[PDB]
Design an enzyme around this catalytic site. Structure first.
Site, PDB file in Angstrom:
ATOM      1  N   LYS A 113       7.118  26.702 -16.647  1.00  0.00           N
ATOM      2  CA  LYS A 113       7.239  26.556 -15.206  1.00  0.00           C
ATOM      3  C   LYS A 113       7.186  27.936 -14.556  1.00  0.00           C
ATOM      4  O   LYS A 113       6.448  28.070 -13.585  1.00  0.00           O
ATOM      5  CB  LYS A 113       8.484  25.711 -14.921  1.00  0.00           C
ATOM      6  CG  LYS A 113       8.703  25.072 -13.547  1.00  0.00           C
ATOM      7  CD  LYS A 113       9.846  24.064 -13.676  1.00  0.00           C
TER       8      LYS A 113
ATOM      9  N   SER B  70      19.927  19.921 -23.859  1.00  0.00           N
ATOM     10  CA  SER B  70      18.610  19.484 -23.447  1.00  0.00           C
ATOM     11  C   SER B  70      17.575  19.908 -24.499  1.00  0.00           C
ATOM     12  O   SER B  70      16.797  19.062 -24.949  1.00  0.00           O
ATOM     13  CB  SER B  70      18.335  19.906 -22.017  1.00  0.00           C
ATOM     14  OG  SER B  70      17.006  19.636 -21.624  1.00  0.00           O
TER      15      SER B  70
END
Lengths: 281, 274
Positions: free
Chosen positions: A46, A241
């Site tokens: 990102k 995560s």
């Protein structure tokens, strides 16, 4: 040479290492490699997508030297952009709810971002509006959010750089909206039409699956277990995560079998989860 | 050629954090200043590559075998890097430390599968050293000796990317790292000048530098703002010293320093005003 000498920090953005797992992967599975995004505060895919957008704005005349970026943001998204902005030499204005990212804002400020705290009462809507207002009122440049439809070429190249030009048989990652994952899916698909793209989620919320082969769901307790295993066995202290991603990647690896490659990402370190049952003992 | 590294093992990253030019904070008429961003990998320091070197030497010597135990004393900011290294390597690690050790730092070490033995808080590091030494004596565990070889040199050189500067600047520490670095760099370039940084209050250091805390913080903020590298106070101190040396060296020369710490660690401090 193993240690890199580089003339600029910008060369590091989204360029965190891709590392083979050597102990937790079944003998009959595809290889599992993890992009260790939590290493470097601007180290995510990102982040390099954000750098691409900045470069394309330069190219399209839409942002010039000593200009101002304005962004309604928060989390490790805003930290990444603050890193990116300061690395690139642009003034950065971040608009956010006053309720969002106590202390994570001090990170943004550490990179010389100007924070505008919008009233709690509006949430994200107040932050979006204030940024929109700043575009209209001050002539700051606001990046188009990746998720919304209304270059692709530079994007793809930048994504490929974040992969080190390694084209896997499968990529597995978490999603916010699924926007980043879609961009990655597209770039990888260009290079390998057969690549499998998997969204990972924890165990309203509605994804656009057009580029996806699969949505994988992973139990929280499994995410924790996988994370601890990577810590103990691999010497990579990943977050929950990441652990969720690793668990997913292994599942896909077992399906693909020997001599294939699965890439996943570790968005988070263990550091962030000191309070959780990750750190029992 | 490629910026993202694909690697077969985590061990290949140990001590291999990148060396990055500063582009904004350094006068143009000075030497270039590059900073090893040690804080951008939990096992990313020079010290960490030294520790891996010691492990590999013990392996080759047979002083450490498969299924063997590494034992190490620790206090303050120290022990996390070693835990990383050991778990990467596949060995049991026993860490001894005063019971006054940060719960935070401890959980980090445990996260890498380290067995922690808490030594009396009153005896500080001395208690931790004695227990480690006792464990060596009692059970034959392997102790690195990172507390107060040709392959060592090569491994340090690898942590430099085989970049041999005109000057290197770092915090004293206990002694270990800076001494080793100074020897390897001077063996590589007899011209190299080494500078040891101290907080304002051997044959290896050319100069001792003192950098006030206020200076260190200011430097670290400027690096954050101008460079987009969120360094800690001790990094700030190092970068300030590096620039001072750089100003004296002049154009066309190289200063390497180290960022041991990120900004992250100092959210409570004068670093985060605003």
């Amino acid at each position: 040479h193993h240690t890199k000498i580089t003339n600029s920090i910008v060369n590091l953005i989204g360029n965190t290492p891709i590392v083979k797992l050597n102990r937790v992967v079944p003998e009959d599975a595809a290889d599992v490699y993890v992009k260790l995004e939590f290493f470097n505060p601007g180290g995510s895919i990102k982040d390099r997508i954000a750098l691409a957008m900045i470069e394309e704005a330069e190219k399209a005349g839409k942002l010039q030297a000593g200009g101002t970026i304005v962004e309604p943001t928060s989390g490790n998204t805003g930290v990444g952009l603050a890193m990116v902005a300061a690395a690139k030499g642009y003034h950065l204005v971040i608009t956010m709810p006053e309720t969002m990212s106590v202390e994570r804002r001090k990170l943004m400020q550490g990179y010389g971002a100007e924070l505008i705290l919008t009233p709690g009462a509006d949430g994200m809507k107040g932050a979006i509006a204030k940024a929109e207002e700043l575009v209209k009122e001050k002539g700051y440049f606001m990046p188009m959010q990746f998720d919304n439809p209304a270059h692709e070429e530079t994007t793809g190249k930048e994504i490929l750089e974040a992969f080190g030009d390694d084209i896997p048989d499968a990529f597995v990652a978490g999603v916010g909206t699924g926007g980043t994952l879609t961009g990655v899916g597209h770039a990888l698909k260009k290079a390998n039409p057969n690549v499998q793209i998997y969204a990972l989620e924890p165990a309203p919320k509605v994804l656009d699956t057009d580029v996806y082969n699969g949505i994988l769901e992973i139990k929280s307790d499994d995410a924790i277990t996988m994370a601890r295993e990577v810590g103990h066995q691999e010497g990579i202290l990943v977050g929950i995560s990441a652990g969720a991603n690793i668990k997913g990647a292994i599942e896909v690896a077992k399906k693909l079998g020997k001599g294939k490659q699965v890439i996943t990402v570790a968005p988070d370190g263990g550091d962030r989860y000191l309070s959780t049952e990750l750190f029992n003992y």
